[PDB]
């Protein structure tokens, strides 16, 4: 059949991508109905970004600061308000190709598609996960600020991320459309670090359950194990511990494969204890934690 | 900055995706202007596919066989011709959202974006490479037949693949829009195998040159080496040998990093000889051969 890490298609969200500028500052914005959302840190220069007071910087910005372009065409800003770290620019036009949308806040574990833009012109897309420590292993270059993370469930567009800033580490932070940052992070250039990255365990399990269906099944053992016992092994190797929900959610996989989730844990457990002796599952030599059981089911 | 395997956006090609059916047979087609392309094996059932004569099977098909739907709406077929393994259905309508397009035949080495469809309804997209042995490690389920592989260079759409068939191995074959199969493969269900899979070496090199720029540079040695010497090592481990072009193409990377390509070969060479002792380059424990130097440059 085949397995690959896979983004939703991007036609809908491409419809909503605009360029914004505020002096020398040029980033990406999202045009939904009569509104345009974008990172608020657009009103900053470099000298500002150290300790910026947004209350106080935007007190000094006018609607005639905010150049907003719709590809070839331009828009006219008609009122500027700031919600947390996102800036909501009202304009004269409603997006003619605004489609069924909704803002969601995702939880650390879920995955989403990302549309990397540069001057409102989308460049690319890739599937991505919301790390334990509320970060993302992304591809983000200067003025990818305002590029977004979405999903598509039954026509509706499920906007869940908007990018703000890279980190000294090199992983990327950003908010939802509420404007609230995923994590303890704020938009300034102070020595921010991100906590311990661990592995989305439930997901790896779904990735093994995947592997099986795709035929690849060298790594299967006989063993059973307790949940706790499995966990008292897993957490040693920086992995997320595992709940009765996790099992519940991994239920439909365990059906199609006639493999119990307990028996899969001791199987995984034994990869952690032993290693891989340089073999590959679904052609990978690391354990792949960026698949939710919904991702993998949908892929099948 | 960040690195991720990355597909072009899919809005353009989504515009051109249609469902086709021919009795009980339902696959994906591509509507460009007044034409619709699709895999010809759509005129087959299962009993046929063993040894089908297409000349002779289509002699028995009419325009009123060919149900062709445009999402909600339907089309009217008005003449059916077969070019190699692709079938060209003329219809009454030209695609209103046909954009600047061109058919290209890619060469074994190049990468492209893939739009997986089911009943003309796109499900997903992922970046993919045209293997040495003219195969692809894909995600393709029944009736992904007619899902396509494209690229975008400066507005133009560069259609380069259309899927036909999985293989007993589990990798996927298909043609260009010419209709000619990438590889020695034909559309029937005989015991087809695919030759030796080797590694797109130039690409791995571009993936190392990537790694460096992204800061990750544990794996650097001092050494130089000859091209031939490098090759007399590489080919042992099933890798594609390396040409003066390959070097030429890897030229602009070698500029930005102040690292000679010769010195990069002995560096790679030493991963092959030694291993990795379970470290990671750009967070991967296998060497990543699905990036062309154009991919990686564009990503930067």
Written overview of the protein:
Chain A is α+β, with helices and mostly antiparallel strands and 300 residues long. The first copy, chain A, has 3 domains: 12-91, Trypsin-like serine proteases (Thrombin, subunit H, Beta Barrel); 99-175, Thrombin, subunit H, CATH 2.40.10; 201-298, main proteinase (3clpro) structure, domain 3. In chain A, 21% of the residues lie in helices and 26% in strands. In chain A, strands 5-4-1-2-3-7-6 form a 7-stranded antiparallel sheet, with no helix packed on it. Chain A has a 5-stranded antiparallel sheet with strand order 10-9-11-14-15, with no helix packed on it. A 3-stranded mixed sheet of chain A has the order 8-13-12, with no helix packed on it. In chain A, strand 12 (152-153) and strand 13 form a beta hairpin. At the A-B interface, strand 10 of A face strand 10 of B. Chains A, B: Residues 1-300 are cytoplasmic. Chains A, B: The active site is at 41 (for 3cl-pro activity), 145 (for 3cl-pro activity). Chains A, B: It is found in: Host cytoplasm; Host Golgi apparatus; Host nucleus. Chains A, B: 3CL-PRO exists as monomer and homodimer. Only the homodimer shows catalytic activity. Interacts with host FBXO22; this interaction promotes the proteasomal degradation of nsp5.
Oligomer: homodimer
Rg over alpha carbons of chain A: 22 Å
Second-tier CATH architecture of the largest domain in chain A: Orthogonal Bundle
State the total count of DSSP E strands of chain A.
15
* Class by alpha and beta content of chain A: alpha+beta
